[model samples]
Target chain A: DPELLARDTVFSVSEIEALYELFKKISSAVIDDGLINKEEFQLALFKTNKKESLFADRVFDLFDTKHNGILGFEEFARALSVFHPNAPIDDKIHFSFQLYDLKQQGFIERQEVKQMVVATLAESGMNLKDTVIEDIIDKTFEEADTKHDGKIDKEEWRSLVLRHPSLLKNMTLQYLKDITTTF
Target chain B: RRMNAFDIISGSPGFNLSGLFGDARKYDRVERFVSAWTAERVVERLEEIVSAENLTVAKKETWGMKIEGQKGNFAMVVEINQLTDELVMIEVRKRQRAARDLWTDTLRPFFVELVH
Candidate 1:
């Protein structure tokens, strides 16, 4: 099945082995079912202790591709591939955009950004006034929405990222030594 | 009950350090152990015992040592890393090659105490 999975996922045998190794470890935390549920995925990502986190929930749902409410090994590998340091920039760009597009409406809008910011703060048990949230969202749109269209599309997002490339810093995990490098 | 150090390592085909401690998965294998000994002291002790037993040193440093054994031409690497003033860590690996777990047959000396 590794070969079958690797054919389209662009991962080799050893990468699959490493992914399976990590997948097994995380999956063992939740009932030893070998599939990662949202709670288990959150625990694995160090986002535990929060009953709700919008960003974590969205990411987990995206990773749980089949909507089965759990992440199988192949789904885990495919989702992680986009974050590999060697993954193509286009894929990273698309993936990062998807992270912000909470409604999957093809654009990052004000409400989505506010929700993300609020969720991030809530995850850390921090609370801010509504006025502060609105101010932050306005600042984000001012910086990101170069087109002044009130929504950040892929092109505007790419331009914004190019200027502040740190936005995509989490996209690549340098610690994940490329499979070819080790294998 | 918390698992013993050996139990953790022996249980997995390849163990991850964060999984060993279950803290946050932020560290690697050697970073999981907390020992009062310094890296230099641990490596110094290992060199003394490994060399006195007639094992030739292929590599030696403050952090670890690599000794080649004559038993089936095996070599083992031991890393003794000092994470902080009061916390030291340890990791041991044996060379694997040619579709075989070659160095599994070569065991560490019984007197070699790696950590507290």
Candidate 2:
């Protein structure tokens, strides 16, 4: 079973097994359920499930994949596969674009990007001045909006991330390369 | 005072007195703790701590960083594993002989600080 998952993802059989171990730990952290709920997911990440966060919500939604409000093992593995270092660059780019799209509107608008930027900074416990946040949005759009359309389409996002690889750096997890050893 | 097997092993969860009394001699080179902070925030705090201690971040990655102590021989790797959107498991590994003191005197304190 893990062999099939390994083949589909960039991981090896042992790596997939290790991920299962991790998944089990996370899923059982708060509740002993086999499926990962939002609370369990939040508890695993933030150490508390009570707080609300847009960044966390977006990541959970993306990982949920099935729109079923719960994360099964296959969904978890496949979603995490995109973070594998060897996963296709396009996959990472697309995932990053989706994280910023906010409304699933097929493109990343300035408002959505600003909201995500604020959420990301808030999650990191960093506070930026309103003007500073505006500056960041302006700079990002200036560089990423190649069509002057005020929105970053998948193509523009790909180009922007290609030029600034750091934007996609978080997409690759170094530990996923040797998850068995790391875990 | 050098750390004995019990001191190091007991620091990890689920390996308390019971496990310590009946254990393998294999010593662990790493210490871990969970934080509610995001990986980026954890790394930023670590950078600040290392800078205050006059250590240079020799190598940096999205997942972790390698800090070199002032004497150049002492180094350690601080790895951040994101367990969830809001939580991370931070592991500190001793990379050089001189790093032991840094771990005892600096690293543990850093973890304690983050806890509060």
Candidate 3:
């Protein structure tokens, strides 16, 4: 597992060390076990209050690359790679697509886009009427849904990103880069 | 004339005690700590603390410092290799038994006080 993460990703030693510290804390209460589980990951993020949220479920699923309920250090580290501020644009794009692909159907569907748009709006406490929501979804699909298909595939997503970089404004975290950017 | 391990380790943030003695001989403790601090800076910081604590510097170099404390002779070695720039490994080996409690009485508070 370590070999796979190391080979497939580029993480500086300091970044790896930082990840290990967090990993150790999350893995510690596993009754002194070595592997980190979904619960521990969720608990650390939300203080064990909301482990079964839609966002938590999806993020945890993405991190669990092996499809097993438990996660090793390699899985944790490699998963965090996608969220790193310095991660490549392609990785950010792909991850964003997956984040919005609520059904995991390999493409961002009309309803899925609407779901994410609503979630984002709700998070910001700016609720919109049904018509406004429909208008937002319609404009998104009209612009991003190339190939005239109902779903936005990877190619279409890339084309969309090229046109409106603001779509990925939430992808980069400057604080994360500050912690792991230097040697 | 003894310095508590926690006092020394806490002020020197970014370093954590990773290794300690207990393998070979009885009551012989050798402690090792690591940090993301640069090798040069760590050595210099050690110099200030060791001297301020009244320990005699047996030898001092960019990579290491050997000192004579009240109860023991200590050697702090720093590793600065190409691949390990962000981390510097420092080891405190108590060769003599005069300055005692390197673990039980000296460094126990460190494990309790580590933050971040």
Candidate 4:
């Protein structure tokens, strides 16, 4: 599933390429879907920028990790993982989709995604912007190994769990669980 | 029905500048728009107090609506919102930054708990 599976029965490179081209044009506004215009997407990228802001394209480029003409499925999935690294791919998809369907319509209209991106960059701050995206990803990150060894990996997520003595246990039972801000 | 004024400005979606900052001309952050709502709520409370009491009682009735603020900043405004109108405030000031400085002095017991 991680590999780019190009199939005539499924997704082909051409189709991926078309989607990538369209995404390149509308990736910023993709989040706005039905709520705004491709122009509005630009507005969202630039926040209050009513004028055409060029920053959205560069941000879109950053997400195009492989520098392929089209954003492959793997690249798209990883872009989402950037927002929430510890989350399952499905969860990341859900979040990306929620951002896309800002208008709450079932389908993400291409015109809308464009406006969302531009306006977002010009915005006070977009939650899905690079820095904010990185922050959300970091929130769930955990370093499993306490020893000075390898970099933080998936195992670190489990290894970082902390347990305290009776004081914490009492609070845990009373509150139905211990309070901890994981990240 | 249609969310207007305060509801329009509460950091929720679709609350554009036209809804709140029509008179402002321009602002730096969404926060400027937000602070406007807080300022308006304070003014509305003060107006209510001005209407409720006779001239002699009105000055004292002003306290019936707890306006919070900094001691030295004359430009500051304050307010205390309560579910019961019995504990509401309405105040006004020329500048918002000054008004924020004013809110510091109105710390109730609950706010004290938040201090730790």
Model 1 RMSD to the real structure? 14.0
Instruction: Kindly list the per-residue Cα lDDT of model 2 for residues A1-183, writing each as its tens digit.
Output: 899998998888898998898788778876687989988877665556775766567778899889999999999899888988889998888777786677987787877766665554443344445665665566666667779898889898888777656556556666566668645
Q: What does candidate 1's lDDT look like per residue over A1-183, in tens digits?
A: 688767666567778787787788778886778788877876776535454455566677778779999988889889877766777888878877787688987898777777665554443233445765565566566667778899999998887767655466656665455444432
Instruction: Please list the C-alpha lDDT of all candidates, in the order they appear.
Output: 0.59, 0.66, 0.54, 0.31
Clashing pairs in 1: none
| List of chain A TM-scores, every candidate | 0.83, 0.92, 0.83, 0.24
DockQ-better candidate, 2 vs 3 = 2
Interface RMSD of each: 16.6, 16.9, 21.9, 18.9
Best by lDDT: 2
Off by over 4 Å in 4: A2-51, A85-183, B1-116
lDDT tens string, model 3, B30-73? Answer: 34343456556655665666656666677766546665665454
| Best candidate, DockQ | 2
Q: Distance from true position, residue A16, model 2, in Å?
A: 1.2
What TM value does chain A in model 3 reach? 0.83
Worst 10 residues of 1 chain A by lDDT: A120-129
lDDT, residue A148, model 3: 89
In model 2, what lDDT does residue A95 have? 78
Q: How far in Å is the alpha carbon of A125 misplaced in model 1? A: 5.8
Q: What is the lDDT of candidate 4?
A: 0.31
The residue-by-residue lDDT of candidate 1 on B6-116, one tens digit each, is 122112222111221243223222222335677676667766756666666889775577777565455666765443334454556555333323233223332133334
What is the C-alpha DockQ of each candidate? 0.02, 0.04, 0.01, 0.03
